[PDB]
């Protein structure tokens, strides 16, 4: 559990994503940035690109500050890697792992954390997170695990 | 002479049912006793008629055990008489807003030639038909602090629902109170409530 | 009559309003379905002063917003 | 379905229908509207997995057609089973994973 700000997407790549006002151009930019291949040759890269693209779309729908953008993107990538790091059912371990990771961003105590965020947005995630992916955990498990 | 069992049934509206059941027990055309707006206390009263053509001294079994809570059948016991008209009272008392359905199976064991007869019962419950007059009460004039004013307003439940109810007021200073806090209306009963305002804020 | 002011009379007006955008229209027919196929539970183009016969608005039994003056 | 531990496809289907039962357990569909939407999800699952080729738009149109069959009152081809808030919400359902997770279920349930 560390600070994931400007870890995978920097300010320049985020500005490129910001200039892409349309869904398709932004999907192209994300594919260029993530070093993913064409979605038509591999389904895994297509799934990852769709996930990140829609993520940016709804994050557009609400509205926040850029360091939050990079923190959320890097945390998504890290927890996806953790969920697909082992083939065994590992829902609760990733659950608690990133539960610990929150406090490294939601409460102000440096250098282990920093107060970039608000309680309402947090709880919004608790909400959306436990709503979708650990429900669809087996879907990504069947794809990204040996 | 040897006799069989033929299901001869009559609706509340006098509609006959086909002999040697072909329409009475067709899976597509299972007679569907759907109910109009029924409340939670005055049950959906419908009468079905069953016709006998033998003098056999035999019993019958009503399977759905007998249904409880939401369905009541009258009578529940008694061996019918030859050529006698066995009337069955169907009472439907729904417990929630969602529309309820029940399946009634009349088991007959005289012998595809003949099989058990199945009833479909469905009935809807209105959520609330409670109306307030006036839906907005205003105290015209300037009430000084420590001065109380009370007004009577009339509530009626144009339904067969003597449902108990509670009256909660959004008052940060206990300015406004209503009596009774809890009450039990009766079916189609109209109730008078008194609202007291003891405000003193400028 | 005002419980405190002698002779003064306070007048209150109540009017139901629209819970949402006033520019949201409502079609002339709420349903176009034959009166029996439902599952039961002009004069000339006179652009002049044709009285808009406001059908007495269906009595909103507990409307969600009451405009007050 | 077999045990979820022996087949991942049955595990995925059981999870889908388990989140089907746990969600709809509040705001309120009657058991009628319940089995309606429930067979909606099952039928569009079968339609989406019927071919290995991409059929997102066709299955979308099929779902919306059956949706308005369950939202409009016109017997014996459509029943006024769901409300308008409810029917827009039902439209909101299948849109909002079964055509984005469409690739996940496509990889799983297309031999």
Strand line-up across the major sheet of chain C: 1-2
Portion of residues within helices of chain A: 55-70%
Largest sheet of chain C: 2 strands, antiparallel
Please give the count of helices of chain C.
0
Beta-strand content bin of chain C: 5-15%
Shape of chain A: globular
The rounded distance between the terminal residues' Cα atoms of chain C is: 17 Å
Number of strands of chain A: 0
Shape of chain C: extended
How many strands in all of chain C?
2
Cα-based radius of gyration of chain C, to the nearest Å: 20 Å
Order of helical and strand elements of chain A? HHHHHHH
- Secondary structural class of chain A: mainly alpha
Number of helices of chain A: 7
By oligomeric state, this entry counts as part of a larger assembly
Helices and strands of chain C, in N-to-C order? EE
Major β-sheet of chain A, in short? none
Greatest contact between two chains: B-C, 16 and 17 residues
Structural class, from helix and strand content of chain C?
little secondary structure
The proportion of residues forming helix of chain C, as a percent range, comes to under 10%
Rg of Cα set of chain A: 15 Å
Q: Explain this structure to me?
A:
Chain D: This is Cilia- and flagella-associated protein 119. Chain D: It comes from Mus musculus. Chain D: It is found in: Cell projection, Cilium, Flagellum; Cytoplasmic vesicle, Secretory vesicle, Acrosome; Cytoplasm. This is part of a larger assembly, with two copies of chain A, one copy of chain B (202 residues) and one copy of chain C (69 residues). By secondary structure, chain A is mainly α. Chain A is built from seven helices and no strands. The longest helix of chain A is centred in the middle third of the chain and has 20 residues, at 43-62. Chain B has 202 residues and is an all-beta fold. Chain B has strands at 8-10, 32-35, 46-51, 61-63, 71-74, 85-92, 100-107, 117-123, 130-133, 149-157, 164-166, 176-179, 182-184, 190-197. Chain B is rod-shaped. Chain C has 69 residues and is largely without helices or strands. In chain C, strands 1-2 form a two-stranded antiparallel sheet. The two termini of chain C are 17 Å apart. Chains in contact: A-D, B-C, B-D, C-D. The B-C interface holds B 36-37, 124, 131-132, 134-136, 138, 140-144, 147, 149 and C 1-5, 8-12, 14, 41, 61-63, 66, 68.
């Amino acid at each position: 559990p560390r600070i994931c700000m400007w870890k995978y997407l920097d300010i320049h790549s985020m500005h490129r994503l910001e200039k892409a006002a349309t869904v398709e151009k932004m999907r192209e930019v994300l594919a260029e940035l993530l070093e993913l291949g064409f979605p038509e040759q591999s389904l895994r890269d297509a799934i990852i690109l769709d996930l990140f693209s829609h993520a940016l779309i709804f994050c557009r729908q609400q509205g926040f500050s850029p360091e939050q953008t990079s923190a959320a993107c890097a945390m998504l990538q890290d927890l996806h890697k953790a969920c697909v790091a082992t083939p065994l059912g590992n829902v609760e371990e990733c659950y608690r792992y990133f539960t610990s990771v929150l406090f490294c961003h939601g409460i102000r105590r440096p250098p282990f954390s920093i107060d970039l965020f608000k309680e309402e947005q947090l709880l919004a995630l608790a909400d959306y997170v436990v709503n979708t992916y650990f429900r669809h955990f087996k879907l990504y498990k069947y794809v990204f695990t040996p | 002479t040897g006799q069989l069992v033929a299901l001869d049934l009559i609706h509340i509206s006098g509609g006959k049912n086909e002999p040697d059941p072909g329409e009475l027990k067709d899976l597509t055309a299972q007679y569907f006793i759907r109910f109009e707006p029924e409340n939670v206390q005055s049950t959906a009263k419908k009468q079905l008629i069953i016709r006998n053509a033998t003098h056999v001294e035999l019993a019958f079994h009503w399977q759905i055990p007998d249904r409880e809570t939401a369905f009541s059948i009258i009578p529940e016991k008694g061996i019918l008489e030859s050529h006698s008209d066995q009337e069955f009272i169907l009472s439907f008392s729904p417990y929630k807003l969602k529309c309820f359905h029940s399946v009634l199976q009349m088991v007959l064991e005289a012998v595809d030639d003949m099989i058990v007869l199945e009833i479909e019962v469905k009935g809807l419950a209105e959520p609330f038909q409670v109306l307030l007059e006036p839906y907005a009460l205003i105290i015209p004039g300037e009430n000084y602090i420590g001065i109380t004013v009370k007004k009577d307003f009339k509530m009626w439940n144009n339904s067969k629902s003597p449902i108990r109810y509670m009256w909660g007021k959004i008052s940060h200073c206990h300015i406004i109170e209503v009596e009774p806090c809890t009450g039990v209306i009766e079916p189609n009963e109209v109730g008078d409530f008194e609202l007291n305002l003891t405000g003193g804020v400028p | 009559p005002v419980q405190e002011y002698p002779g003064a009379l306070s007048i209150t007006v109540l009017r139901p309003f629209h819970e949402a955008s006033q520019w949201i229209m409502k079609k002339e027919l709420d349903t176009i379905v034959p009166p029996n196929l439902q599952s039961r539970s002009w004069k000339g183009l006179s652009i002049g002063s044709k009285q808009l016969t406001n059908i007495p608005a269906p009595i909103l039994e507990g409307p969600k917003v009451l405009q007050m003056r």
